[PDB]
Amino acid sequence: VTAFLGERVTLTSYWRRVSLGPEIEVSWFKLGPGEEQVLIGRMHHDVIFIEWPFRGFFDIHRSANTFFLVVTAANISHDGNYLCRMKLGETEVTKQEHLSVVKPLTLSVHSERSQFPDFSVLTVTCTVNAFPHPHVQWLMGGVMKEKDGSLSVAVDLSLPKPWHLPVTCVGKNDKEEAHGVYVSGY
Amino acid sequence: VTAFLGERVTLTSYWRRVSLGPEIEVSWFKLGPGEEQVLIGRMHHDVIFIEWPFRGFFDIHRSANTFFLVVTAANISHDGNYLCRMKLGETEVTKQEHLSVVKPLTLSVHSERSQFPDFSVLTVTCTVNAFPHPHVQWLMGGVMKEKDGSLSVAVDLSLPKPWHLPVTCVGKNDKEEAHGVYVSGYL
Amino acid sequence: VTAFLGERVTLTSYWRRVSLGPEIEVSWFKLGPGEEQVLIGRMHHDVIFIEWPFRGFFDIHRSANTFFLVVTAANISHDGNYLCRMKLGETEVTKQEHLSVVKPLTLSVHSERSQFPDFSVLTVTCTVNAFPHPHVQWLMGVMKEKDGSLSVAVDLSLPKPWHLPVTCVGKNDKEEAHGVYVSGYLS
Amino acid sequence: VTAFLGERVTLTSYWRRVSLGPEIEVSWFKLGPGEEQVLIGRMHHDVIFIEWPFRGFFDIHRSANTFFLVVTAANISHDGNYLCRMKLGETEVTKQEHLSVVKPLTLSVHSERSQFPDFSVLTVTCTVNAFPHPHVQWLMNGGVMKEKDGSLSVAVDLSLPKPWHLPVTCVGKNDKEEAHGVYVSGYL
Amino acid sequence: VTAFLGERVTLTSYWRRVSLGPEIEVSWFKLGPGEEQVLIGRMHHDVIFIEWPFRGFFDIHRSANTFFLVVTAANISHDGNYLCRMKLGETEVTKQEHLSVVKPLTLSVHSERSQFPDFSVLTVTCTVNAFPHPHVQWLMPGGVMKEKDGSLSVAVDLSLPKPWHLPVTCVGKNDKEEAHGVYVSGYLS
Amino acid sequence: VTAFLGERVTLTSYWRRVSLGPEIEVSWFKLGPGEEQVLIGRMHHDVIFIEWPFRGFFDIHRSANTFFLVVTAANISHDGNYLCRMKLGETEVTKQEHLSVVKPLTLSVHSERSQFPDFSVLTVTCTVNAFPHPHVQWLMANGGVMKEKDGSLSVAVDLSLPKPWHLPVTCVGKNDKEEAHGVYVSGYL
Amino acid sequence: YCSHMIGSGHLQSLQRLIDSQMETSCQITFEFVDQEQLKDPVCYLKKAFLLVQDIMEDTMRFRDNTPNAIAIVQLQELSLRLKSCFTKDYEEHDKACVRTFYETPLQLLEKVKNVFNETKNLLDKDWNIFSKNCNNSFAECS
Amino acid sequence: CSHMIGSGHLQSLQRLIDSQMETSCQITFEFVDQEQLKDPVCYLKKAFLLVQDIMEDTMRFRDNTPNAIAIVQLQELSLRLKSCFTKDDKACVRTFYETPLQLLEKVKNVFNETKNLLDKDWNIFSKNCNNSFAECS
Amino acid sequence: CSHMIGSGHLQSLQRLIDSQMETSCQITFEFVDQEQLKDPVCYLKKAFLLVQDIMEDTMRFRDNTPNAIAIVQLQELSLRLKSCFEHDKACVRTFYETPLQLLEKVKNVFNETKNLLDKDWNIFSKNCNNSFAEC
Amino acid sequence: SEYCSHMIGSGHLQSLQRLIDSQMETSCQITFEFVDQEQLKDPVCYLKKAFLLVQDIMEDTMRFRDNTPNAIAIVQLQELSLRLKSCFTKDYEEHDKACVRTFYETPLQLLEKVKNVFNETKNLLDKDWNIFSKNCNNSFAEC
Amino acid sequence: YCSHMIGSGHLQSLQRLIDSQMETSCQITFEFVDQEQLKDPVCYLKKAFLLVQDIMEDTMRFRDNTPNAIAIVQLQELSLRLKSCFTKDYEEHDKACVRTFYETPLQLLEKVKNVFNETKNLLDKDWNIFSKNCNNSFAECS
Amino acid sequence: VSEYCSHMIGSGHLQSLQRLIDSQMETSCQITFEFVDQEQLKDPVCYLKKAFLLVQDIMEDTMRFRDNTPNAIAIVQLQELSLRLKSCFTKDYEEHDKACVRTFYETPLQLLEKVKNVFNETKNLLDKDWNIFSKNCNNSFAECS
């Protein structure tokens, strides 16, 4: 599945036999990089317990033969694979589930004129802050990482006099796309 | 005159008589609102002194019959009229000079989909931070003041499914103008 | 219902007709004192949304004709009545549900000897930090903590010879515990 | 000698000859670990001077052939040996004096029930904060921590599966000092 | 009595009868202004106890029929009268004792030349920080400040247009204590 | 040239030929120690630009064949040599210019009496805070050189006088040509 | 009269109802008599019985005119005739001695079949038994 | 194969659904993604293969009850049908969180729709769906 | 007016400029904003009235020197010309330029006036009230 | 043997004052090298040293449009100056570019300084022609 | 009259008192005449003498009816008889010309023996000498 | 090995001791000195034994009077007496030296009362049994510090 930043998104797993729900020892894990396994929470006989580091960001509940992992609010840390171990005594099944988190791209533009040696070189800056693959391009720079875990990148474009305006930049985040047009100076 | 944010901008005044330069007792003032008069600096016989509150933001110098007030770096506080008093004993002349400071507008866009009751209502936000007259409009919100003294305003636009894209917003700062087009969502 | 500090506790409500689950417009409220009504979250057609002030402390989900309000971690603020409004167009039912939060009492004891006029008057302090009704008493000031819990203690002066051992009794409603002071450092 | 936390305690030294009091060049030192010698203060001909780092925590005065080092308020830093150097011209005598500082033990207890897989395993925690030798033990898992005030704390937990074999009692003690904590009953 | 800033100063009281020392219920007080009485500490049967607000600034001890109030380190707050109450059952005696605290004056001088309209007007500043009565004055033929440490400071300026009539001398004094500052020459000219 | 702390001082360079002013590509540098060259600002065809680290402490302007570097406010960091490169296509001239910044010396005196073993040893302290070469000396004993926040230098020396105090006694502070004195007249009692 | 009110053919359909249901881990909420608040089996069946009407309608719903829905109406038919065999008690006792249950339908049906089947057994033995005044026993609940 | 699916088989299927209680309950199960595989010829083909495993994991009733009997008959019938289908895993299939009532409606529809396509043309299920199965993933 | 501006007037003007030293110096002065008032008929008209105040405040030479003579000659000439010709102090701007440049601007005013006057003497009667509004 | 007494004609100085009279009155200032009248006090050696440097000044400083009344004068003064180099005894080469300072002044002032150099030289030549033979190597060391 | 009031046997006991005391570093506080405030030895002994009675009681205390305690009483006896040889002066002068002393007992006794013994020498020479008016001299002190 | 100790301590020795105490002036003064810790060494036989050896150093450091005064005479007599008595005491292990001893901050009057009591108590034990001070107290001296 996939879901945006801040949203309440749910992941699922289930036991094939429709006879059984509570009896299964369900236990979700977040796959940290390098084949790692971090315990998020456990549920058995309808008593759930989420680990303290994940407490209040995740939660688990059950209905019938289905098991849910609710992320009460999604953030960039949560992009990654998740593993569910469902055991019934001797027999145990391991179901994976991926989650992509997405930040809706944020395209910004402002101009500047050069202060030296003249005020002819008009420089414009197109910037885009998205996740997971932001990409900016001028039609016809430095990769930064934000506090919230998202990525930003921008590029500049120098236009000596006469300013061949209007000019247009194209920001995109994978399929998502948006533009910025600069019409005239002050 | 007029100049952008951060720039080294100069204001000027002069004595009509080309015989005289140093002799004039020059003294610049910033006109605070309500007919106020705050002394920025003084110059006479080629000795300049800028007041401590304005020290290092302004400076004065002279060449021939001309007197300069250099703003070493312009900020929004500096938008306003300036007054130059030049005296020669009995006679005194008072020359005014206006300065407009300008911030190059900063147009921003990002989408969001509503989380309740469905994920159909796509809301987009077009924002602009400029000076002195920013203005945003959606082609068929809250006026905030920033730390740097500039002004910001933005507006949202709700589009229920199907999303009638592409849709375009128009930001402008007086003569300056720029647009933002939203093309497509993630899915 | 009832549950201790830090625990993951669940409250429930339900629609009488076993035909209906998602269709109901469920919406939980916390009753602030004085008949007040604060919106915690809403659920309809299996899309849940918790308000930002309660986000990550509460969550709601559904199974069949039953509606659950999970408190991911209980704190003293959460002691109080809760109201569930379940609507079906024109018809609406309002089901209440109380929750008591409890802190396991924390009984403390330490001695002190008086510094003046002599070191005969031995004073011991029995202290207890619990919720909702802590109460300390010695066998022959009410403070409120940051975490919302309550604390109270009492002192007991025993001039020499010290009639030890001596025992204090702390309790939190049904919960009960004691503290015995056996001997001093010397004498 | 020995004295509790916060108290005004006095240490003493003296010149054998009862003829002499002021004449002696008295000078106290705190023995820092590793045979170290830190000057606290000096007194001669009835003029006292305490070093600035110790100023207002210690003070010295005299009466007759006796010399006093008063600690105006005792803290755990002050536990340790003290040395008094008394000189009389050619002859000099060095008298030691130990001081033990004590914190009256602070015994704490609270219960908890396990949150997983059930609420049967009732765990209680008995804790004690004393000085210099606190020690806790359950009748019928211990981390030593050091506090801001210089005192020591230690505690131990006790797991009781259902049915809870109450009442149960923990024993905290600080050398001779001793105290108990009894857990009687749970919430329901 | 009298003593300087930072010093370890002692005040005294005594029982006339040389038989008794410990038996007396001694109790010192600081007289706050307006006939106030603040308890500093108590001593009886050779057990002393200083109140927590005064703890570690004052201390009391005894020898024979004499009672001492030691100020471990003197500060300006300590200038003021002190009262010793000595009781013996039915009978009680009240002995007062004054203490003046003093800060050794601190005379400072530095020049400056005016920045406008010219660099002719040489201004010098003589400053003095003392206690209890500082006073500075320029010899010719002003803001009073209170410091953190409780001491007092005052200074005065002196404008000398060109030519600078140097050398020039200022006189700082703190009651009997006195000291001077002479400015000889500038950097150039 | 030379100038005091806080002042607005100007340095200069010029093109020899009186025909030319704007045309010259002027560019000032501060010489950091070890033959270093830090760009302060540039000017050409009457458009000036000062680098952001130096922005608002320095500024450059022009009149006729003369080029000025104004320091809007002088501080001790600004003491050092400055270099101006003036180019006109192939030909280029490099004019140096030194600047000494100066702090007007600040002479301070206060007494102290020894606290041990007696109150006979009267110790006085003469102190001086100047730049660039402060130097203090007692007329008729250890001297530590300290460096201040403002970049200035301080030094002082003490002088022990056993009873009877052979007063008055005088100290001599000086900063190169600049000179000033301090006299201690009398104690408190 | 009442001794032979509950025919064998009624219980025939009840077990058929349970047999026909699919095995599932599902759960559902419903009102029913708290077997522990009201221990007495005479007064339990008495109280439990009056509330059953509202339950069957809100709970046991099937597609119109199917084998099971027929049985449900038959059970409501049977039930109504039986209200006469029970002496009403104080009306203030209404909605007391009752609790929530979050269980499978299979369990719920097992609880209802047991109410009918246990009633047949106490009725066969003594027809007049359900006249007992349970106002005392209903006070014992919430 | 034309008359392989008797009327008496579907009689029990609708009886299964009629007998079930109306409930808001939901459950998870594997089934063919009707959108990944649009073609109704190849849908019924693929869907049919998987049903054997479903019925066992899903439609469970108390041993020797009217319905459990029907389930075994449907497995009997299912096995017989394997010869009419070219055969000899886990693609074109998705999760479904739905009521049992819905799931039975989906399975009854598989059997009943198969009867209609068998009646019209018996040899229809020989079509090679290897092309159509690649399009899912 | 056709023959009002003699050749001997312009003789001295170029002599003034030739005699001046080459310098990078600059000075400030009022003059007509050649861009605010584009029309050369009305430019010379407006520019001309202001010139009186300029020459006195600007072109100053030691009394009774070859150049100072010329300056007076030009003021003499100028006053006679006022007869051939709220808007006051509009259409005017600052200029920070060399003296050499400024003299070049004034010589150009007189010399351009001679050419338009030779061709049509009555030309300077045109109503520039419309054009002065434009500044 | 020397005919320098009347080398500086009256017609040379006529043009210099003409130069100064013709210049416009201005508040402008400019920088230039010249002899520091205070470093070298002696008026005999001042005019001597000052004179050698003047050639470079006039070229870098007094520039006029080619073949104008003033530019002519400037060339005549360079002409005059060159002939005068023979009337001055050269001194040690190490002294070159010493005894000289910066001046930020009006052109009017600078011209007044140069006219004063020429005019003062005429007065000292008239009185004693051989005067400029004096050894200023001593006086040039003091700067 | 007064000339032979102070017997030799009185001072004999005073030195025996001091000889009998143990050598100690101890110190004690007591009132006595400020020998510097009142320089005149005629008026010093005069003022010093009146106060002594109170001193001896507050200071020189010995176990009852021991060789020394006897002497102390002998000295109080002697002291009382002598009050007649001294002319009282203005009563306002009471408790002036007096200071604190923090000294050994040995020192204190040495001070008192000095008062009595110096009094004997001035009395043998001129008996009535202690009548001259010291009201002038007592004003000079604190 | 000691013989005749019984009447070593004459009555005239103790006479002067009480004269010493009677003659001292009543004072609130206090002084510090070494003496036997009566609680560390409870046994009165070994207490007097240990206490006695230390007295020699005490009297010199403590009881000082002006030369050839009535009291100083007594003090020398007591040292005189003390020296003869060292023979009546059997020496013990040298490691025990300076143990069983404590500080006392008391009046001289108190200190003399302690010393008079040592001499007077010793006389009573000598009178009853002369050879008594031969007991080996090495056992008892280990017990203190």
Ligand SMILES: *[C@@H]1O[C@H](CO)[C@@H](O[C@@H]2O[C@H](CO)[C@@H](O[C@@H]3O[C@H](CO[C@H]4O[C@H](CO)[C@@H](O)[C@H](O)[C@@H]4O)[C@@H](O)[C@H](O[C@H]4O[C@H](CO)[C@@H](O)[C@H](O)[C@@H]4O)[C@@H]3O)[C@H](O)[C@H]2NC(C)=O)[C@H](O)[C@H]1NC(C)=O
């Ligand atoms: C846009 O541009 C404008 C104009 O250029 C700026 O406005 C001025 O900014 C300056 C500097 O930031 C402000 O000056 C500040 O004044 C404070 C007032 O202090 C008083 O008291 C002290 C001590 O008693 C006196 O020394 C002082 O003279 C004042 O009387 C100062 O406390 C500030 O601290 C300064 O001094 C200390 C040392 O004394 C230094 O350590 C600090 O670095 C600092 O230099 C400071 O000087 C001034 O008030 C503003 N204009 C006025 C007068 O209104 C804007 O800052 C700029 N940006 C914005 C957002 O508008």
